[PDB]
Amino acid sequence: NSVPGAPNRVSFAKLREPLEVPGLLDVQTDSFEWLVGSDRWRQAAIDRGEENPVGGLEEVLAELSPIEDFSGSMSLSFSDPRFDEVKASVDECKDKDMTYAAPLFVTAEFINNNTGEIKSQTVFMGDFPMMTEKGTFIINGTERVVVSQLVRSPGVYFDETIDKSTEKTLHSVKVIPGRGAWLEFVRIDRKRRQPVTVLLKALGWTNEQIVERFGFSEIMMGTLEKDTTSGTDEALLDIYRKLRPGEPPTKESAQTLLENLFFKEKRYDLARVGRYKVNKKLTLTEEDVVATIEYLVRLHEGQTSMTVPGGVEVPVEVDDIDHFGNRRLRTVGELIQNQIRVGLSRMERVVRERMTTQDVEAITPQTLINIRPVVAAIKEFFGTSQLSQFMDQNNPLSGLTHKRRLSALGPGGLSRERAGLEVRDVHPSHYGRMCPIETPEGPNIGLIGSLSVYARVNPFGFIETPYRKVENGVVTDQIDYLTADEEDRHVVAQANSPTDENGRFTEDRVMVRKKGGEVEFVSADQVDYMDVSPRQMVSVATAMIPFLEHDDANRALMGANMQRQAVPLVRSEAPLVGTGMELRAAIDAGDVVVADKTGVIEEVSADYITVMADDGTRQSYRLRKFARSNHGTCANQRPIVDAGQRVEAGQVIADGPCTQNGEMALGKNLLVAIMPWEGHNYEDAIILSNRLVEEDVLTSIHIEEHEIDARDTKLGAEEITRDIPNVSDEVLADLDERGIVRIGAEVRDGDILVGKVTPKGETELTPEERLLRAIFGEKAREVRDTSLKVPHGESGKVIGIRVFSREDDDELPAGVNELVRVYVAQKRKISDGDKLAGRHGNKGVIGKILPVEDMPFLPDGTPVDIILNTHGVPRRMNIGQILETHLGWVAKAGWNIDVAAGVPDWASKLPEELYSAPADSTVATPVFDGAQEGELAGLLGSTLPNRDGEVMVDADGKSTLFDGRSGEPFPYPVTVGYMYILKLHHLVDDKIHARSTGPYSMITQQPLGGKAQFGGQRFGEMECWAMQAYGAAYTLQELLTIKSDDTVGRVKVYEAIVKGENIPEPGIPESFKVLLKELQSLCLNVEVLSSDGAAIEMR
Amino acid sequence: ADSVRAYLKQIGKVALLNAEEEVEL
C-alpha cells in the first residue's frame, strides 16, 4: 500500500497507519553522512536546528588545530577536509579484494612564530572507506557491517545501596566523563580512604565557606570537623601521595596536579553528551564539582528539589543507568570518529616531537606529518573490531536486521561475562525504541537487540520514538519525535483507542502509560500524546510474524531468529498469510531492484533492465546472477517486468533472492496435516511429500569458493600447471591447459580443481621406491604435488573461475605470482535431516519423506505435503501456528459472505471490502490488529469447490484424510490447511562428518577437530565420566590412547585391522609425555618411578 | 609500583653537572 507496484494483499487491520514506516536503513546512512558531512547532511541540520553544523571529520579536526609545542614558537594547523571520487566501484572491489574508499585530503598550515613565515601544504591522509547505498562497507573485498554500540552517557548518576552491615542508607555517586579518571563519593582513581572535604579545601576554599555552603548538611560539617587537614596546600599533599605514590612532590606539581587532571581540557575530555547531561541536570568547572556534592547531600536528606547556590531548580532523585534517557548508542559515524581521533592523537605525538629535532625552517606540514597511525586506526578498526562484522546474508531479512542491531558489548562497553541480568531485562523505556521480543537465545540474551520499526536516532545518540500529541481529548496530525527523557514527562495514549468521527476520544476513558512507566486508566482529559500505531515496540522481523499476539514471547523470539536463518529457494514463493511488513522490508533491504524515476522499460534481459524515463534520461540496472553470498546462499535476481511496461518511481523492477513481487518470501506455502502419523513425525520431527523433491519447491542452490595461490619459494617459484607427478590421465581429464578445472565440469570429493607444484629436496628417495623407478622408468620428479582438491563430502558443478597472474599486470602481495579462485555450485533437494520451521518458533528436522502415493490425502485425491505432530503444539503456547494454518486454507480456497440479507454479527467490527476474495488471494494480518477469532470461524465455512462443488474443509478447519497406505479413511476428522514454513541454514550435507584416520595436531598428536581438517569427535570430560560409570576400562583406555594420542599405537592398530590380527596393547599418550616436559620447564622435577627401579625415561 | 617509575626515582637522586664539573671529572 502506497508503494506504486504493491501487490494486492488484503488487510484485517481496523486502524490506519498515520505514519509510514521510516526508511529502516536510515540509522546507518545518517550516522555516516554526519561523519563525512556531505551536503545531504548539511541541508538537514541547516533547515532545522543549530546554524553552525560541524561534520564529524571537521569536529575531530577542530580538536587538533593547532599543534603548538611548549614554546608556542611553531604552530601546525589543520583545516578543510576533502574527498575525491571513489577509487573503484563496489562491484569492482568485491571482485579484486580491495576496500571501497575515497582518498581524503587536508590543508596543513605550519607557522613559525619567530620568523613569521607560513607554509601551506596539501596533505594526503589516506583512503577513507566509504559506505554503500545499502549501509555496508567493503573491506578487503568482503561486505561488512558496523553495528551500533550501547554505552553509558557521560553524566552524574547517583545510586542508593542499603548498607551491607548497618542497613543504613548510603550514596554513592559517580561521574563518568568522555575520557580521564573517574571520581566517586572523594574516592578517586580507585583510591579509597579519601574524605570528600579534604579536596573541597584543595581548591583554596577556606573552611568558613564550607560552613557557609554546607549549611543544612550535618555530615558536611562533621566531615570537616573530623578531618585533620589544616590548610589548602596540606590537603593537596594528602591528595598527592595517594594519587602519585612514590614521587616526592613540588609546590609546582602539587597545585597543577588537580588543575591538570580535570579542569584542563587536554587531560579531561568534556563530552557534548556529558556537557549536556549535567548542565541541565545541575570542561569540568569548579562550579560543577560543588553542585555535585550539593546534589548528593540533598539526596540522602530526602528533599526532592535542589536550588543551586546561584543556580536553577531541578528534581533531586536517583538515576537509572538502564533508562534510555541515560543510555546511548554510539552509531557508526561516531565509532569511526573515535577511531580517527585516536589516529590523530598518535600522529600529534610525532608532530610535536618532530618539531624539536628537525632543522627549523626546513620543517613543512609534510615533514612533521606521518600518516601511518591515522590509516592504521581505520584499517585496524574494520578488521579485528567486534563492532565491525561480516554482513550476515543468507536472506534479505538477515542483512536488514544486522544493520539496526544494537549491542552492549565491545570496546567502550561492558564485557559479556561481567554484566548482570539487570541490563538484559527489558526496561519500560524500551517501548517503541528497542524491540523486546528479539534477542539471541545464547548467553548474549538482552545484550543484543534490534532497533524498533519507528525508532529514530538522535544527533546526541539517544533513541526517539514517534508520537501523535493529543490535546483536549483530540488527537492531532502533529507527530513529534520524543526521547526517553521527554516521554517520562507526559502520558502516552494507547495506540488503539476508539476514534470519533473527524477524530477525538470516543471511549469514556483512555489507555495511558505513565512515567513509571506504570500503566493507568484515566479519562480523555489528562492525555498529551498517543502512540503512532501498534507494533511500535516490535522490530522488523518480529512484525513479520502473523498472529504474533497469540504466541508466547519465548516462541516468538525463536520465530524471529529463525526467519533470518532461512535460505533463498530457487522458486521463492511469497507467504499466503502475511503481515504488513513483507512489502516494505524487502525494498528497504536493498536486495530488490527499484526504479528511481518514472518511465517505461526499453529492454528486459536476464542480464540487465533499462528504463526510459519521462525525463528523457536513461537508467539501467545490472542484475545480480547466482552471486555467492557470505555464508554460501544464492543472491540470484529475476526481472518481474516486461518490455512495454509502464513503471513509477520507487516501484520494483526485479525480485531478489527471497522476494516475490516485492514482498519478502522466506519460505513456501504448504498443505499441512496435524495428525500424528505412524511414529514418523514424533518429538518435533516432520514428514514431507516426495512432491517437494520432484517439484523442487524446497530446493535451493549453494555456492562454495575455493582458493589457491602460486608464490615464490626459497627453493624456486610455485607453478600452476596441468602436470602432476603421479596421477592417471583420468584425474586430469577435467583440467584445461593451465591445470584449472574446466567450467561446467562435475566435481566429486577429492577431485582436482587447480593443479599446483612446489620444489622439493634434497629428496632421498627410499630404496624400495628407487627400484620401482628403474623398473617402470618413471623419473622421480623434481617437485612435490601441492594441488587444490574439493573438500571431503562436497560436490557440484563448476560455475566460474577467477585468475590473477603476476605475468598479467594484475596485482598481488609480495611473493604471490598467480591466484585462481574456483566457484562450485549445487542444487540441494530438500533432504531427510534438513531443518524446517514456521514463523512461530516451531522447528524440526525432516524425519521422513513419503511417496505421494501413501500420504494423508483429501477427498479430492490431493495429498498433504507436511504432517506435523499434534503433541508439540499445545504445550508450547505457539498456537498462532494453528490460526495461520486455518487462514492459509481460507486464502487458498477463497470465500464469500455472509450476505445477504445483512452482514452477520461477527463481521460488524469489521471486515471492510473483505467480504469476498477469490481463490489463491493473499492475506495480511498486521501483528497487533489482525484477524480476530470470530472472523476466522465465519470464514472457515467457505468456499467450494475443489473443482466439483464439494467442500474439502469444515467450519472447524478439519477434513477426512484417507491413508494412502491402507486406503481406508482415518477414523476422525483431522485439521488440514496451508502453513508457511521456511528452509533453514542447518543442512545435513554440511553437518554429517565421519573420520577413521586423518591429520593430527603438531604439538599434541590428537586429531584436530572441525570439518575443514577432516577432524574427529571430541570425547570430553563428561563423556569419560559416563564411560567410567559403565565400568568400561578398555573402551575408555582405547579412546584416550590408540584412537588419539598414541603415535606408535594408532599406526599399529591400523596395521592390525588391515591384516585382521588382534588389536595390540596401547602405549603412552603423547599428551602426557608433553605434560612432564611442561612441568620440567617450570623447574618442577617430575620423575616416573616404577615399583622400582626408580626413574623411568620417556623416550 | 611500576618498574620504570622505580628507575626514574633513583636517577633523579643524582645532580646535573655544569660545564666546569664535566671537565673536572
The largest sheet of chain B, given as strand count, sense and whether it forms a barrel, is:
none
Tell me, what's the shape of chain A? globular
CATH topology (fold) name of the domain at 448-530 in chain A: Rna Polymerase Beta Subunit, Chain: C, domain 4
CATH superfamily of the domain at 448-530 in chain A: DNA-directed RNA polymerase, beta subunit, external 1 domain
Q: Proportion of β residues of chain A?
A: 15-25%
How many beta strands in the DSSP annotation of chain A? 55
Using a beta-carbon cutoff below 8 angstroms, give the protein chain pair with the largest interface and the number of residues from each chain: A-B, 3 and 4 residues
CATH class categorisation of the domain at 448-530 in chain A: Mainly Beta
Helix content of chain A: 10-25%
Q: In DSSP terms, counting alpha (H) and pi (I) runs of 4 or more, how many helices of chain A?
A: 29
PDB class: transcription activator/transferase/dna
Keywords: TRANSCRIPTION ACTIVATOR-TRANSFERASE-DNA complex
Entry title: Crystal structure of a Mycobacterium smegmatis transcription initiation complex with RbpA
Chain A: DNA-directed RNA polymerase subunit beta
Features:
part of a larger assembly, 2 chains, A: 1099 residues, alpha+beta, Rna Polymerase Beta Subunit, Chain: C, domain 4, 7-stranded mixed beta sheet, 6-stranded mixed beta barrel, 29 helices, 55 strands, globular, B: 25 residues, mainly alpha, rod-shaped, DNA binding (chain A), transcription (chain A), transferase (chain A), EC 2.7.7.6 (chain A)
